[PDB]
C-alpha cells in the first residue's frame, strides 16, 4: 500500500505527502484520511518534528496479518523522536461512554487524548514522543519530595474532582468487534496531566478499555450483547517510557463486559465474584487475550505503574516501576471523588500498588523491578510493589522490589485466590514484606530471598490470612537477633511455614518442623542487601547475564546452608518450577531462596 510523510519543519499541506521529497506539514492531513487508511499503509513523522497543539485520532479501520498499518518516524534518528503534543486542546477531546454501569466510578465524560486508536486492528505505532501537557500543572518526579503543605517549591496541581481526564495513548473498542494486533513500541509518553482521582476513564499514560456498542435496556439484550463483544486480543506495549502522567501509568482491559465476568444481576454496580475462581471460557470470551507488556519504564505515575484488568493469561515482563503513587497522598488527593451520579467520597481510591492484575486469570509477572512506590506514610493505603488483587492464579516470579513504602507483595481481600510468589528478591521494603489482608486461599510463597531492615518486618501488622511459606530465606538485617511475629490471624489456616532459612532471628515459626537457622548472613549469601536502590539511568532493567551483576550478593556462598537445602516444591497453582531469579535451571533438591549457585 501507500506511505505518507509529515515534516513539522520542512513539509507543506499543499504537497502530495507520498514522498520524503514532498511531505505534509500537519497531522490534520492524516486525521482526514485516518479511517480510510488501508492494509500496508504507513504514516511517517520526521525525527525532529514537533506537532504542538496537535493530535492523531485513528478510528474504524484495520491492517491485515500480512499488511499492517504503521505510524512511525523517518529521517535522522539523532534529531529525536517526532513529538505529538495535544496540550489538552479542545480538538483532541472525545466523548467516552462504557454504555453501562461498570463500578462506583466516573465512566462517562470528555477525554483529551494525544493518540486515540478506536476500533483499529493490525496497526503498529512506534518511535513517537507523546505529551498531553497542561502548562498550569507542574509536579515533576525528577525533583519531587514530600511537602507538608500543597504546591511547595513552585509545584502546582489541579486537585479538582471534575478535572478533565487525559490520556497519552487511548485504545478504545466499542463496535462489539475484537480490536486485535495493536503494537505500541518505543514511545516516550510524559506530562499527561489527567484527573488525579479517576481510575476507569481514559486517564493516564496508556489506557485500553472496551465499551458496549449500545446501551443494555434489559436481560432481553444479553443474547445479542454476548455475540457482539467489544474486546482486545494481541495488544503489545514494549520499549516505551511513561513519565509524569496522571493518574494511571499503563492500564489494559477495563471492560463493560465485566458485568458478565463479575456476574451482575441488576447491572447497578452489584457483583458476585463467587469463590474468586474465574472460568477460562468467561475471561476468554468477554475479556482480553494475548496481552503482552514488556521492557517498559514507568516513572512518577500519579497512581499505579502497570495494571492488567479482565485479561486472560497476560504476560508482564522486564518492566521497571520507579517512584509511582506520587499523587496518592493526603495533601494531593483532597477532593470528594466523582461517580456518574454524585460522590464516591473523600479518600475514595487513595490507594496504589506498582505492577499488578485486576480480575485476571493466571497473569504472569516476571523479570520486573519496582523501586520506592510512594506515600504509604502520607495517605497511600497500599504502597506495595506487587498486588495479587481480586483475581485467580497470579504468578509473581523472578522480580526485584526495593524500598517500597509498604511491603513487597499484597494479596488483597476475600476474592484474591491461587497466588504463586516465587524466586523474587525483596530488599528494604518498608513496614512489612508480605501483606495478607483478609486474602482468599491457595497462595504459595516460596524460594524468595527477603532482606528485612529495621524499618520493616516479615508480615504487615494488618496481615491475618493464608500463605504457604516454603524454601524462603528470611534475613533479619538489624544489629541484634529479632523475635519476629511469624504468625498473625487464622483466615483459611493463617500463615503455614515449612523448610525456610531464618537468618539472625531469635525464634522460628511454630509450624516449621524443618527450619534451617543461621546466625550470620555472610555464612549464607555473598553480600545480602547490596542490590540497587534506584532504576538504571537508562530506565532498562539491570542486566542478569555475565560473570558480574548488581544482584550477585544474593548468590549463596560455596558451602552456604542454603545449598540443596530446599524441599522439592509441588506448586499449589500448577506452575512448574523451572529456573531461579537469573535463569539458572533448578538441579536436584532446590537451593533455599531465589538463587541457584
Ligand atoms: C480488593 C480491593 O479493594 N483492591 C484494591 C483495588 O481496588 C479496586 O480496583 C479496581 C480497578 O481495577 C476497581 O477500581 C475497583 O472498584 C476497586 O475497588 C485497587 O485498585 C488497588 C490499587 O489502586 O489496591 C487495592 O487496595
Amino acid at each position: 500500500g501507500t506511505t505518507y510523510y509529515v515534516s513539522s519543519e520542512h513539509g507543506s499541506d499543499d504537497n502530495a505527502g507520498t514522498s520524503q521529497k514532498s511531505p505534509w506539514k500537519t497531522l490534520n492531513k492524516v486525521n482526514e484520511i485516518a479511517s480510510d487508511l488501508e492494509p500496508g499503509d504507513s504514516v511517517l513523522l520526521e525525527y525532529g518534528s514537533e506537532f504542538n497543539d496537535q493530535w492523531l485520532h485513528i478510528h474504524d479501520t484495520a491492517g491485515t496479518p500480512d499488511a499492517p498499518i504503521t505510524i512511525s518516524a523517518y529521517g535522522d534518528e539523532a534529531e529525536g523522536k517526532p513529538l505529538i503534543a495535544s496540550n489538552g486542546v479542545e480538538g483532541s477531546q472525545w466523548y467516552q461512554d462504557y454504555r453501562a454501569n461498570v463500578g462506583n466510578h466516573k465512566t462517562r465524560g470528555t477525554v483529551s487524548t494525544t493518540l486515540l486508536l478506536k476500533d483499529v486492528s493490525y496497526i503498529t505505532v512506534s518511535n513517537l514522543e507523546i505529551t498531553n501537557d497542561d502548562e498550569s500543572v507542574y509536579d515533576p518526579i525528577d525533583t519531587w519530595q514530600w511537602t507538608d503543605t500543597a504546591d511547595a517549591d513552585g509545584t502546582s496541581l489541579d486537585r479538582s474532582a471534575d478535572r478533565m481526564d487525559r490520556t497519552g495513548v487511548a485504545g478504545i473498542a466499542e463496535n462489539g468487534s475484537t480490536m486485535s494486533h495493536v503494537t505500541l513500541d518505543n514511545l516516550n509518553i510524559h506530562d499527561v496531566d489527567g484527573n488525579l482521582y479517576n481510575k476507569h476513564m481514559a486517564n493516564g499514560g496508556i489506557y485500553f478499555m472496551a465499551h458496549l456498542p449500545k446501551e443494555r435496556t434489559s436481560a432481553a439484550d444479553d443474547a445479542w450483547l454476548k455475540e457482539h463483544v467489544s474486546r482486545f486480543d494481541h495488544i503489545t506495549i514494549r520499549n516505551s517510557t511513561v513519565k509524569d502522567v496522571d493518574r494511571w501509568g499503563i492500564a489494559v482491559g477495563y471492560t463493560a463486559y465485566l458485568n458478565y465476568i463479575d456476574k451482575s444481576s441488576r447491572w447497578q454496580n452489584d457483583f458476585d465474584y463467587g469463590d474468586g475462581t474465574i472460568d477460562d471460557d468467561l475471561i476468554a470470551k468477554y475479556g482480553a487475550t494475548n496481552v503482552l507488556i514488556e521492557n517498559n519504564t514507568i516513572i512518577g505515575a500519579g497512581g499505579d505503574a502497570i495494571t492488567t484488568m479482565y485479561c486472560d493469561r497476560p504476560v508482564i515482563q522486564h518492566n521497571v516501576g520507579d517512584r509511582v503513587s506520587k499523587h496518592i497522598n493526603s495533601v494531593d488527593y483532597t477532593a470528594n471523588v466523582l461517580n456518574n451520579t454524585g460522590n464516591a467520597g473523600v479518600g475514595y481510591g487513595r490507594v496504589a500498588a506498582g505492577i499488578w492484575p485486576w480480575r485476571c486469570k493466571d497473569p504472569v509477572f516476571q523479570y520486573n523491578e519496582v523501586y520506592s512506590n510512594l506515600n504509604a506514610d502520607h495517605g497511600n493505603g497500599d504502597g506495595q510493589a506487587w498486588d495479587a488483587d481480586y483475581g485467580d492464579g497470579t504468578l509473581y516470579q523472578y522480580n526485584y522490589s526495593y524500598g517500597n513504602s509498604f511491603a513487597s507483595l499484597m494479596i488483597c481481600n476475600w476474592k484474591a485466590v491461587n497466588t504463586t510468589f516465587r524466586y523474587n528478591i525483596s530488599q528494604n521494603d518498608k513496614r512489612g514484606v508480605f501483606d495478607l489482608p483478609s486474602n482468599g486461599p491457595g497462595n504459595h510463597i516460596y524460594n524468595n530471598t527477603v532482606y528485612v531492615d529495621a524499618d520493616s518486618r516479615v508480615l504487615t501488622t494488618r496481615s491475618n490470612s493464608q500463605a504457604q511459606f516454603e524454601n524462603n530465606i528470611f534475613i533479619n538485617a538489624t544489629d541484634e537477633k529479632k523475635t519476629e511475629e511469624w504468625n498473625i490471624g487464622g483466615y483459611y489456616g493463617g500463615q503455614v511455614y515449612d523448610n525456610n532459612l531464618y537468618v539472625n532471628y531469635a525464634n522460628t515459626p511454630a509450624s516449621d518442623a524443618n527450619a534451617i537457622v543461621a546466625d550470620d548472613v555472610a555464612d549464607v549469601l555473598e553480600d545480602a542487601g547490596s542490590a540497587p536502590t534506584a532504576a538504571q539511568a537508562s530506565g532498562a532493567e539491570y542486566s542478569r547475564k555475565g560473570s558480574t551483576t548488581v544482584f550477585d550478593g544474593y548468590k549463596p556462598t560455596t558451602n552456604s546452608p542454603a545449598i540443596n537445602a530446599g524441599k522439592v516444591v509441588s506448586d499449589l497453582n500448577d506452575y512448574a518450577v523451572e529456573h531461579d531469579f537469573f535463569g539458572n535451571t533448578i538441579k536436584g533438591k532446590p537451593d533455599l531462596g531465589a538463587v541457584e549457585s
Side-chain angles (χ1 to χ4, degrees), residues 102-105 199-200 207 247-248 254 271 273 303-304 307-310 328 348-354 356-359 380-382 384 387 389-390 410 412-416 462:
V102 300
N104 188 22
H105 307 274
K199 284 183 73 193
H200 303 292
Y207 219 128
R247 179 194 164 131
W248 228 293
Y254 210 73
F271 314 101
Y273 298 115
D304 305 83
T307 304
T308 57
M309 298 166 179
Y310 300 98
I328 314 305
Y348 181 78
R350 204 173 71 224
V351 297
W356 60 277
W358 174 257
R359 293 291 291 172
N380 183 357
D382 288 338
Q384 310 87 358
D387 169 17
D389 210 299
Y390 271 23
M410 176 161 61
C412 193
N413 297 317
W414 222 247
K415 311 309 182 165
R462 76 176 190 177

Side-chain angles (χ1 to χ4, degrees), residues 23 110 252 274 444 509 584:
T110 296
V252 172
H444 208 175
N584 314 305

Side-chain angles (χ1 to χ4, degrees), residues 254-269:
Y254 210 73
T255 171
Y257 295 88
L258 66 80
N259 282 291
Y260 299 127
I261 298 162
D262 299 353
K263 290 178 183 314
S264 191
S265 275
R266 302 182 260 112
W267 289 56
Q268 298 274 353
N269 293 158

Side-chain angles (χ1 to χ4, degrees), residues 66-370:
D66 260 322
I69 302 167
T70 306
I71 319 306
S72 196
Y74 79 98
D76 178 353
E77 186 149 344
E79 303 276 347
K81 293 165 192 69
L83 167 56
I84 310 185
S86 71
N87 303 316
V89 293
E90 292 148 279
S92 74
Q93 289 171 15
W94 63 277
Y95 182 54
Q96 178 159 47
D97 191 4
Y98 278 84
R99 292 191 185 87
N101 291 309
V102 300
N104 188 22
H105 307 274
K106 189 186 159 155
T107 58
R108 199 158 71 222
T110 296
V111 181
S112 172
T113 306
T114 309
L115 203 147
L116 170 69
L117 308 162
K118 196 222 71 85
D119 299 291
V120 190
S121 299
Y122 292 101
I123 180 160
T124 299
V125 180
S126 55
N127 305 160
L128 310 187
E129 193 193 356
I130 301 167
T131 73
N132 191 331
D133 187 26
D134 188 335
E135 289 178 321
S136 76
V137 182
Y138 192 67
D139 195 20
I141 193 58
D142 282 349
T143 66
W144 181 91
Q145 218 199 52
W146 176 252
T147 64
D148 269 333
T149 59
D151 297 2
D153 305 324
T155 80
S156 188
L157 275 187
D158 174 7
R159 298 169 173 74
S160 304
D162 68 322
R163 177 172 181 81
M164 173 177 65
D165 298 272
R166 296 202 186 204
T167 183
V169 177
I172 302 295
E174 72 180 352
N175 285 350
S177 66
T178 299
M179 182 164 157
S180 85
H181 301 81
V182 181
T183 304
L184 311 183
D185 181 7
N186 191 27
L187 309 186
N188 174 16
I189 298 159
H190 63 96
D191 299 276
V192 179
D193 293 330
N195 182 281
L196 293 185
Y197 304 104
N198 301 333
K199 284 183 73 193
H200 303 292
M201 299 298 304
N203 192 52
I206 307 176
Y207 219 128
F208 282 65
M209 51 263 287
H211 308 155
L212 300 186
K214 42 146 238 197
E215 287 72 30
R216 174 194 181 279
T217 311
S218 77
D221 301 330
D222 293 326
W224 191 86
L225 251 19
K226 298 180 166 166
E227 302 297 300
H228 312 89
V229 178
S230 327
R231 59 174 296 273
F232 294 122
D233 178 72
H234 273 104
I235 314 306
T236 300
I237 303 168
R238 75 164 71 173
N239 309 307
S240 297
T241 294
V242 174
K243 183 185 201 179
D244 295 321
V245 303
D246 285 290
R247 179 194 164 131
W248 228 293
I250 300 166
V252 172
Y254 210 73
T255 171
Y257 295 88
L258 66 80
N259 282 291
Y260 299 127
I261 298 162
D262 299 353
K263 290 178 183 314
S264 191
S265 275
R266 302 182 260 112
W267 289 56
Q268 298 274 353
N269 293 158
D270 61 306
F271 314 101
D272 171 2
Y273 298 115
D275 59 20
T277 286
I278 297 177
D279 306 347
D280 294 336
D281 44 296
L282 208 52
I283 193 87
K285 192 185 190 176
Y286 296 119
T289 53
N290 310 286
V291 166
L292 176 63
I293 303 168
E294 63 175 1
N295 292 270
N296 305 304
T297 305
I298 319 296
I299 319 157
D304 305 83
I306 304 180
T307 304
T308 57
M309 298 166 179
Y310 300 98
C311 297
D312 180 354
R313 280 151 192 102
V315 166
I316 307 96
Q317 51 187 17
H318 301 292
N319 299 284
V320 173
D322 181 22
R323 286 177 296 151
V324 304
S325 304
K326 177 208 289 156
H327 288 151
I328 314 305
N329 70 76
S330 54
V331 167
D332 294 337
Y333 203 99
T334 56
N336 188 347
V337 175
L338 269 42
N339 58 31
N340 289 323
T341 278
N343 287 285
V346 178
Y348 181 78
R350 204 173 71 224
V351 297
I355 296 171
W356 60 277
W358 174 257
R359 293 291 291 172
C360 298
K361 179 53 180 291
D362 301 359
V364 180
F365 296 85
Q366 61 194 10
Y367 310 120
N368 307 100
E369 306 169 3
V370 170

